[PDB]
Design a binder for this molecule. Structure first.
Ligand SMILES: *O[P@](=O)(OC[C@H]1O[C@@H](n2ccc(=O)[nH]c2=O)[C@H](O)[C@@H]1O)OP(=O)(O)OP(=O)(O)O
Ligand SMILES: [Mg+2]
Ligand SMILES: [Mg+2]
Ligand SMILES: [Zn+2]
Ligand SMILES: [Zn+2]
Ligand SMILES: [Zn+2]
Lengths: 559, 114, 263, 133, 84, 43, 159, 158, 141, 65, 196
RNA sequence: AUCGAGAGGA
DNA sequence: ACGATCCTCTCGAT
């Protein structure tokens, strides 16, 4: 396990990572020092000597330099010590272990590596400071974030080896992943949160910026497009310029709930000839979804073209946002005065319901549903009653939130946040729960020594009425804490148990592959599938299409 | 340990000239002037002035990466008008206004008590 | 006179609130930045420690020294060591100060910047003088000593700028506002009910006329008039930060002009 | 070097659905009851209101990088106040003796309903929208 | 156990993995000062070259496709179609 | 240092769960993640 | 339960139907019960579905199951993937676990089994009964540091 | 009716709708024979297997049945003519197009599906962490182990 | 003088405990809408009253400001990080020779304190600085 | 550990105001708030600088050698 | 990290100018992304800022003690009396441009910790150094200039990428690599190598 | 450098 | 019988 199938290899490097918005999706920022260490055995050839000799002269401590020079006999001339290190006339056939340079292909991975996407080839980009720098939209496949994660880099040593990385494991090649048969890299955080704003109908840009944004897109055809407006002031819309990022020949229809080729809600999406016609741009369009502008652009224009799509969209949108700004504060969690009123009482009735059930139950009037203890039915009710309460006070809060509310503002982009977050931060937090049940009687017949024995009322058993804003009460605190813990714990568990499963699966199938007769057999040769996936079709090259012959009335099938 | 010396922010190194002028290839009468060891302060000021000249069809700029202190000014001018001239003018018009401000300030500063 | 024109409101040894009008925002800014980062100044940029029986570390003390503000008016006639043809430094490109302090009394002896002692030949130029605005005249508290603690230093102050290091900034803090009422609509205020009752009102509004209810949106207007104020560490008199600022920026520009030429 | 549609419209409703610089206007046509209009207009640059007499024009003239002034003393299809440019996408059969069309001005939308336009209305990108008084 | 050039059932099209190994192996030969059967429009990197030796079907390499029984089929890089 | 000196360890039905009776005696929050979570407590 | 159903007019409609969920299993005897539609009776206990309806059915449920685990989480996974699993779990005519008791016994070379839970032992009972490893498993060529029948090592290259 | 199948036909169409600038005002130059016989013929050149024998020739038919269904429902006479006014040229292109794409959507011998799958299930599994049944990890574990002591058994009758 | 007692979890079983003394022993004879909601002092039985709920916490969590306006687990994380923070762990760090010591140049007492930091000597040996922060999308870095 | 020379944030020299500040507290019997403003420390970047400082050196000096 | 379970590494430093600024001329020492807030529901953080701001202003120690009657209102009420927007927002201008930022920002002081574990203390990076005597495999740890673990899991990925050659090169040419002589009759490493 | 115990990072 | 990856470091002993 740790010596034969898993070894400690040479030419490896590891450090902290951080995002870099001006780096291409498929690159990776390698801190100068690391590059000065990792090397690559390049043989001397008339197509290079000049560069090679020049580097050998640069020596092991100036970047585009090298270490070691290998000769016919198999001797190692160490370039940092060697009366003759400032001499050395390179000879065709020799080897010059050179530093890692720009554009080299390298295998970059984050652990745990439970994917192919966890290990991908990136074009090297030597840069200052000491953290691997990576494009944000390469974030998710490796499941990284920049709170401290470290990442490992490996350097191909053989000319073949390199080829194997640049032709099979390159980040471009991996955008549309076979597992979910959809893409596995979208657009996040700022670029996402922003792109949306930048898109709003209400969003217009003028000359000075437009000209910068355009220039900002590297592949710009330098042809300023005519303003959406030419009247009193020539103004362009957001869509207008973003569309510059989208290449030609890309088409995309959408239709969300209320769409209607006039989408009064600037809904759905309509992109023709690489020009965005209607619809705000957010997660559904640019996310890593199935229909996505990415799934389409990869399939249509090519992996690389789509690789670029990322940086472009980013460079533009990022810049635009760099100048529009965006933020959040407590303010964003405060709800309309009359609202908190409507909310607080929204709960006030939930409690009365629970209370009214309770008294009913205690009168033995309750009718126990089949298969459940009158006791079970009781609990289930209250829990339902309280959940709804939370959810409505929550909904109640979500409506106030003005389109200008930054939290809501991110939720709409789909860049962070969800009902729940709002609902808890703004209105009632909720009913705490341990082991699928509302807080237990750790003490005799009671929850804490601050309650009287036998007390199934909501407060007593873990219903945190307050919001994270208003603040919890000791009891609430403690309770919410109990659940908190239950979470952290199975958190530690759901990790190991899964880690194990991840392996048993991997060992079990390990050796199964699609042979040359389109069959699927394991080492023994024992056929497992006569045609892979039953259609001998590769998962990545697939997409959800509609079989227009199944639905519709018999009349419509005919019409 | 991988940090670059601060002075590399304003001191040209070896083989680095304050400007490089390559002819843009996409448009006509277009030129991409790269500036070395210069940041937003200049870049944006010159971009703004360059946009006062009515014979200027385009003018934007960008610091491609914060790490490094250099930027690119792009310029496209009316047939027969050399952007380099469009650049010259701009820098001047800029200096002039500057001088002006220098004076007028110094004037006022002197009528002041304290 | 020509374009760009000022209107000082306040003025003193440290501040200069003034209105800069009929200029481009681009410039108002370029100016602002430059003030913050490219005006030269003298500051200790090398400390030779002989003895430090103190409670503080050498480099910890050295750091603070660097931060101590030094006179810099005649800095324009002091060279950059990197340009002086001397080996290392001299009296043409530096200013050497000595610090010697001994814990004498059993009552804690304090060490102020007023104790630095210029050793080099100033060559009759106002340069490198522990700047002191204290009331009691003890510019900055460098360090404190105990019974018999020693501190024997020798610093070499050099010409530098906020860019290599912030210790070299003469500016401190620069206020800057434009279009006090959001007539220009360069922002969209965040509100809970009335963005006008929730968001304060800047002094600068008083110096400008309101928006006039039913008036349409002025879609052609740009940013004229800026209400700034330059605070000054003091190595340079406030008037100068503004001037030298304007100067420097102006030179920066000129050097590109000079560039094309040599091209 | 043409013009493709002229017509005065009477604005019946002006809707600002959670936008502060845009309103979706719906004005009926004076003359031919058959014709109706749905449009997105920047109420910040060009206010509008309850029952206005709007003059509309389409055309496709007065695609090479955009330039700005100079011609401020040249061409001038500036006989109007408000003007937009766009790309039309779908032509639809409102059915009956009526037909409609859809244009997108960088997101600002417009749907036009009538019939004699089968000829006067283009079939391509080009399409300016001119409005006056 | 061989299979005549006829009765050939394997994919006419070259697999990615095949081309990545072909590309690698030729790129490697090119890196070892080996004759180049193409005209360089100014290329220097072995791989980049080898890519262009394939784009002009001038790579004297043949792929031997073993079936799962033991037999196989020899296909030449000249035959194999390179869509991808 | 304070926190180390006020630490608690529990070797080896549900023991890492924060438990009712813990109120007042052991800190409801302070506890290491994963590995010994809930086992190492802090008074 | 909710069940879409073709309406006489053609469109699929929603014709809710009563369904009994159970808290205990005994398939063999319930189908036979009258009134129920033995065509649809189901159980999440694939094993039982195996013993009663045959293995081809078992495979079905086995997937129907796994699937639900993964989709109840909103998450999707292309068929093929899980398919392969289930099938690999279902080719040996029985229900072979992903545990050691199942696939390491498999008929494979010694070395593969080596890389999983019962190395020592597996190698002994392997030495005792002179096993011959083809060396065609990826896991073994990894142990011998040689290329394997992977993308790059399935086809051979020649002059 | 929404199932993942190779070749997004809808797209190819749209990619003809404007690559040949097709006007929905003039009539097509398509022969009913063209379409109908063309669509049919297309179905002959998809292929996933190439043996000349019965058995394999029948597998090949199976592995294409569905897609073809998609294909037929999409490329139907009315549709081609009434839904998206193709022309002998556009249409003729759309076909040549599908073929190629299809052929591109086939798996490549070498593709290590064993692992590729194992991981495709293990990953989304390590994303699981939480109406009274045994689900999530535990259950998945229950399954993979082929346990006999499942906690939430149940029989669902209709 | 018997004004307090030492109770262990076992005896805790047999007692009734009021949280705040005040807010829990006045007779019920308008309410600030921004204050959280608390139930009531329903109990003619109280035998004890909590010295102060904030005491249910311990050293680490004690330094969290408003941990009662924070999602449960985030409080646990912070408690684990306060132990990786830098600052002056002891005024005599200079006279102690030990494997690694990290000290902050200019430690600052937090503008936001806890009535329980006075005992944890935090303000005297702070670990952290009071930086002017801005939550905002800037260079996208 | 001693009063920071100059404010992290804006750069306003501050190290020459510690003793002044202290006096304003002890003898002038003023509240930290005004004491600050009188010393010319008007913005919060420059107010936390002094207000928060914990002059530890005074405790390091009690260590004899 | 703040004091609310929110850690983060620096990603770049900007000098005063390039930084966004307050009309007062105040500039931030640190900038965090709004996106690290909705989900972590770490509201206190926000609050603490509101408080710490008011506090620094009025030279009052801010009391963020748990169970108290301290409201976000009472505080916002205090901060306004101090001439600032009651929530923490403050118009800010973009350092590059000097123009105003279309979106006001949450600006205030917040206690931040400097955690140990600093990049430079981690940056290990080896290119064939010392190897273990027992396995002839690269050594552990960076203090020793060892190698990174290309364990089981990484291998599976490579296998999944179908990159056979690379794999061999990783599990051999780098780390274990050894030449052994074998008996063509009893495949045992029992062949005496006398090379000469 | 082997070896065993705890602490910590994601 | 098994149990998650990779990681850095600290203490102590025949
Ligand atoms: O920062 P954090 O660890 O989040 C990311 C991950 O590393 C992997 N991991 C962490 C801890 C552990 O015990 N075991 C692991 O395998 C997990 O993929 C983590 O996801 O943890 P949090 O602070 O909880 O992360 P966040 O929710 O981003 O604040
Ligand atoms: Mg995190
Ligand atoms: Mg993490
Ligand atoms: Zn000199
Ligand atoms: Zn300050
Ligand atoms: Zn032998």
């Amino acid at each position: 396990r740790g010596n034969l199938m898993g070894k400690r290899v040479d030419f490896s490097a590891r450090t902290v990572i951080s995002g870099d918005p001006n780096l291409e999706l498929d690159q990776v920022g390698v801190p100068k020092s690391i590059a000065k260490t990792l090397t690559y055995p390049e043989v001397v050839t008339p197509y290079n000597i000049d560069r090679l000799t020049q580097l050998v002269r640069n020596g092991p401590n100036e970047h585009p330099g090298a270490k070691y020079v290998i000769r016919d006999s198999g001797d190692r001339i160490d370039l940092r010590y060697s009366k003759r290190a400032g001499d050395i006339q390179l000879q065709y056939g020799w080897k010059v272990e050179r530093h890692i340079m720009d554009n080299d292909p390298v295998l970059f991975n984050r652990q745990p590596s439970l994917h192919k996407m966890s290990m991908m080839a990136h074009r090297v980009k030597v840069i200052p400071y000491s953290t691997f720098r990576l494009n944000l939209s390469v974030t998710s496949p490796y499941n990284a974030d920049f709170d401290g994660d470290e990442m490992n880099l490996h350097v191909p040593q053989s000319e073949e080896t390199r080829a194997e990385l640049s032709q099979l494991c390159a980040v471009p090649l991996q955008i549309v992943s076979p597992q979910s048969n959809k893409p596995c890299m979208g657009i996040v955080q700022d670029t996402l949160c922003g792109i949306r704003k930048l898109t709003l109908r209400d969003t217009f840009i003028e000359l000075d910026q437009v000209l910068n944004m355009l220039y900002w897109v590297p592949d710009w055809d330098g042809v300023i497009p005519t303003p959406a407006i030419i009247k009193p002031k020539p103004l362009w819309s957001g869509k207008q310029i973003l569309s510059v990022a989208i290449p030609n020949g890309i088409h995309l229809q959408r239709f969300d709930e209320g769409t209607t080729l006039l989408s009064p809600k600037d809904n759905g999406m309509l992109i023709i000839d690489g020009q965005i016609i209607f619809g705000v741009v957010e997660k559904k369009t640019v996310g890593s979804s199935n229909g996505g502008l990415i799934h389409v652009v990869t399939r249509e224009k090519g992996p690389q073209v789509c690789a670029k799509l990322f940086g472009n969209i980013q460079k533009v949108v990022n810049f635009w946002l760099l100048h529009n700004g965006f933020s959040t504060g407590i303010g964003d969690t405060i709800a309309d005065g009359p609202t908190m009123r409507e909310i607080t009482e929204t709960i006030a009735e939930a409690k009365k319901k629970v209370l009214d059930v309770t008294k009913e139950a205690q009168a033995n009037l309750l009718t126990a549903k089949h298969g459940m203890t009158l006791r079970e039915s009781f609990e289930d009710n209250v829990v339902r009653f309280l959940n709804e309460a939370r959810d409505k006070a929550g909904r109640l809060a979500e409506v106030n939130l003005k389109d200008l509310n930054n939290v809501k503002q991110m939720v709409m982009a789909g860049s962070k946040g969800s009902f729940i977050n709002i609902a808890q931060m703004s209105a009632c937090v909720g009913q705490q729960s341990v082991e699928g049940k509302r807080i237990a009687f750790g003490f005799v017949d009671r929850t804490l020594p601050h309650f009287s024995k036998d007390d199934y009322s909501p407060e007593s058993k873990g219903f945190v009425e307050n919001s994270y804003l208003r603040g919890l009460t000791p009891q609430e605190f403690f309770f919410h804490a109990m659940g908190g813990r239950e979470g952290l714990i199975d958190t530690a568990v759901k990790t190991a148990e899964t880690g194990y499963i991840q392996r048993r699966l991997v060992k079990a199938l390990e050796d199964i592959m699609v042979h040359y007769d389109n069959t699927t057999r394991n080492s023994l040769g024992n056929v497992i599938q006569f045609i892979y996936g039953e259609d001998g079709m590769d998962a990545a090259h697939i997409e959800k299409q509609s079989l227009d012959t199944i639905g519709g009335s018999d009349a419509a099938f005919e019409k | 340990m991988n940090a670059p010396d601060r002075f590399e922010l304003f001191l040209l190194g070896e083989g680095e000239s304050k400007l490089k002028i390559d002819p843009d290839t996409k448009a006509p009468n277009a030129v991409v002037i790269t500036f070395e060891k210069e940041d937003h302060t200049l870049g944006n000021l010159i971009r703004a002035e360059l946009l006062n000249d009515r014979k200027v069809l385009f003018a934007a700029y960008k610091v491609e990466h914060p790490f490094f202190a250099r930027f690119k000014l792009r310029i496209q001018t009316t047939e027969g008008y050399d952007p380099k001239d469009a650049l010259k003018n701009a820098c001047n018009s800029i200096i002039n206004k500057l001088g002006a401000l220098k004076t007028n300030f110094e004037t006022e500063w002197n009528l002041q008590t304290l | 006179e020509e374009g760009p024109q000022v209107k000082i409101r306040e003025a003193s040894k440290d501040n200069v609130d003034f209105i800069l009008s009929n200029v481009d925002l681009a410039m108002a800014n370029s100016l602002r930045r430059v003030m913050i980062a490219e005006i030269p100044t003298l500051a200790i940029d090398s400390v030779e420690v002989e003895t430090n029986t103190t409670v503080l570390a050498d480099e910890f003390i050295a750091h603070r020294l660097g931060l101590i503000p030094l006179q810099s008016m005649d800095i324009e006639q002091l060279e950059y060591s990197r340009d002086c043809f001397c080996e290392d430094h001299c009296d043409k490109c530096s200013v050497v100060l000595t610090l010697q302090a001994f814990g004498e009394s059993e009552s804690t002896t304090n060490v102020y910047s007023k104790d630095l002692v210029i050793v080099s030949n100033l060559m009759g130029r106002n340069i490198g003088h522990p700047i002191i605005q204290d009331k009691e005249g003890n510019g900055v508290l460098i360090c404190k000593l105990r019974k018999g603690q020693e501190l024997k230093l020798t610093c070499v102050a050099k010409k530098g700028i906020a860019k290599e290091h912030a210790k070299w900034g003469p500016a401190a803090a620069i206020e800057f506002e434009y279009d006090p009422w959001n007539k220009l609509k360069h922002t969209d205020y965040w509100y809970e009910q009335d963005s006008a009752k929730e968001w304060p009102q800047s002094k600068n509004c008083e110096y400008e006329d309101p928006p006039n209810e039913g008036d349409p949106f002025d879609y052609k207007a740009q940013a004229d008039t800026f209400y700034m104020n330059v605070e000054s560490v003091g190595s340079i008199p406030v008037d100068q930060v503004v001037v030298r600022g304007i100067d420097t920026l102006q030179k920066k520009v000129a050097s590109i002009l000079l560039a094309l030429t040599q091209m | 070097s043409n013009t493709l549609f002229d017509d005065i419209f009477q604005v019946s409703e002006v809707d600002p659905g959670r936008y502060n610089k845009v309103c979706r206007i719906e004005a009926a046509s004076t003359t031919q009851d058959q014709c109706k209009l749905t449009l997105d207009i920047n109420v910040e640059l060009f206010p509008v209101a309850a029952q206005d007499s709007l003059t509309v024009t389409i055309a496709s003239s007065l695609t090479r990088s955009w330039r700005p002034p100079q011609a401020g003393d040249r061409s001038l299809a500036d006989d109007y106040d408000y003007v937009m440019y766009g790309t039309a996408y779908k032509f639809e059969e409102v059915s009956k003796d009526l037909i409609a069309v859809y244009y997108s001005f960088g997101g600002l939308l417009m749907r036009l309903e009538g019939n004699y336009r089968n000829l006067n209305n283009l079939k391509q990108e080009n399409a300016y929208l001119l409005i006056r008084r | 156990k061989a299979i005549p050039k006829d009765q050939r059932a394997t994919t006419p099209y070259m697999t990615k993995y095949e081309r990545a190994r072909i590309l690698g192996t030729r790129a490697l030969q090119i890196s070892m000062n080996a004759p180049v059967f193409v005209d360089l429009e100014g290329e220097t990197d072995p791989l980049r070259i080898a890519m262009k030796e394939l784009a002009e079907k001038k790579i004297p390499l043949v792929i031997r496709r073993y079936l799962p029984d033991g037999s196989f089929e020899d296909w030449s890089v000249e035959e194999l179609i390179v869509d991808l | 240092t304070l926190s180390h000196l006020r630490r608690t360890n529990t070797p080896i039905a549900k023991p890492r769960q924060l438990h009712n009776t813990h109120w007042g005696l052991v800190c409801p929050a302070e506890t290491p993640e994963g590995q010994a979570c809930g086992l190492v407590k802090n008074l | 339960y909710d069940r879409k159903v073709p309406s006489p007019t053609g469109e699929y409609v929603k014709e809710p139907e009563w369904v009994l969920e159970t808290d205990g299993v005994n398939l063999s005897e319930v189908m036979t019960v009258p009134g129920i539609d033995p065509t649809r009776i189901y159980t999440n206990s694939f094993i039982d579905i195996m013993e009663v309806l045959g293995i081809e059915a078992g495979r079905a449920a086995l997937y129907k199951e796994v699937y639900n685990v993964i989709a109840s989480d909103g998450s999707y996974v292309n068929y093929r993937h899980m398919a392969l699993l289930v099938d690999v779990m279902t080719t040996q005519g029985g229900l072979t676990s992903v545990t050691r008791h199942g696939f390491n016994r498999s008929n494979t070379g010694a070395l593969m089994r080596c890389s999983f839970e019962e190395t020592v032992e597996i190698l002994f009972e392997a030495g005792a009964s002179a096993e011959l490893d083809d060396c065609r498993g990826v896991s073994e060529n990894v142990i011998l540091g040689q290329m394997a029948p992977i993308g790059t090592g399935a086809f051979d290259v020649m002059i | 009716a929404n199932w993942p199948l190779p070749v997004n036909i809808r797209r190819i169409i749209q990619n003809a709708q404007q690559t040949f600038h097709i006007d929905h005002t003039k009539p097509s130059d398509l022969t009913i024979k063209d379409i109908v016989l063309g669509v049919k013929d297309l179905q002959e050149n998809l292929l996933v297997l190439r043996g000349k024998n019965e058995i394999i020739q029948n597998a090949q038919r199976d592995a294409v049945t569905l897609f073809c269904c998609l294909l037929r429902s999409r490329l139907a006479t009315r549709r081609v003519l009434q839904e998206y006014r193709l022309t002998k040229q556009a249409f003729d292109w759309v076909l040549s197009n599908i073929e190629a794409q299809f052929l591109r959507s086939v798996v490549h011998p070498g593709e290590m599906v064993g692992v590729l799958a194992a991981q495709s299930i293990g990953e989304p599994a390590t994303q699981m962490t939480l109406k009274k049944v045994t689900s999530g990890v535990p259950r998945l574990k229950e399954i993979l182990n082929v346990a006999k002591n499942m906690k939430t058994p149940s029989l669902t009758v209709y | 003088e018997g004004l307090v007692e030492y109770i262990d979890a076992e005896e805790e079983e047999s007692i009734l405990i009021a949280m705040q003394p005040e807010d829990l022993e006045p007779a019920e004879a308008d309410v600030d809408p921004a204050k959280r909601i608390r139930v009531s002092h329903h109990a003619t039985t109280f035998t004890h009253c909590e010295i102060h709920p904030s005491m249910i916490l311990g050293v680490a969590a004690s330094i969290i400001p408003f941990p009662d306006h924070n999602q449960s687990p985030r409080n646990t994380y912070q408690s684990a990080m306060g132990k990786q923070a830098m600052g002056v762990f002891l005024t005599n760090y200079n006279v102690r020779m030990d494997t690694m010591a990290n000290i902050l140049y200019y430690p600052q007492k937090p503008l936001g304190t806890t009535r329980a930091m006075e005992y944890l000597k935090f303000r005297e040996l702070p670990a952290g600085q009071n930086a002017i922060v801005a939550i905002a999308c800037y260079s996208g870095y | 550990m001693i009063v920071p020379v100059r404010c992290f944030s804006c750069g306003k020299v501050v190290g020459d105001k510690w003793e002044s500040y202290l006096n304003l507290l002890q003898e002038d019997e003023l509240d930290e708030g005004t004491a600050l403003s009188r010393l010319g420390l008007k913005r919060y970047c420059c107010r936390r600088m002094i207000l928060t400082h914990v002059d530890l050196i005074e405790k390091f000096l009690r260590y004899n050698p | 990290a703040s004091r609310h379970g929110q850690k983060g590494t620096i990603g770049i430093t900007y000098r005063r100018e390039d930084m966004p600024f307050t009309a007062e001329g105040i500039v931030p020492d640190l900038i965090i992304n709004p996106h690290a807030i909705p989900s972590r529901m770490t509201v206190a953080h926000l609050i603490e800022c509101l408080l710490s701001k008011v506090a620094a202003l009025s030279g009052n120690e801010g009391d963020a003690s748990p169970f108290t009657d301290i409201t976000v209102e009472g505080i916002s009420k205090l901060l306004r009396e101090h001439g600032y927007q009651s929530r923490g927002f403050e118009v800010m201008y973009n350092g590059h441009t000097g123009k105003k930022l279309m979106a006001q920002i949450f600006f205030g002081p917040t206690y931040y910790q400097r955690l140990r574990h600093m990049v430079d203390d981690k940056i290990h990076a080896r290119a064939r150094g010392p190897m273990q005597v027992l396995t002839r495999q690269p050594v552990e740890g960076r203090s020793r200039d060892g190698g990174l673990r290309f364990g089981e899991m990484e291998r599976d990925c490579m296998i999944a990428h179908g990159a056979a050659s690379f794999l061999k090169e990783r599990l051999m040419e780098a780390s274990d690599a050894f030449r052994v002589h074998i008996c063509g009759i009893c495949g045992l490493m029992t062949v005496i190598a006398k090379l000469n």
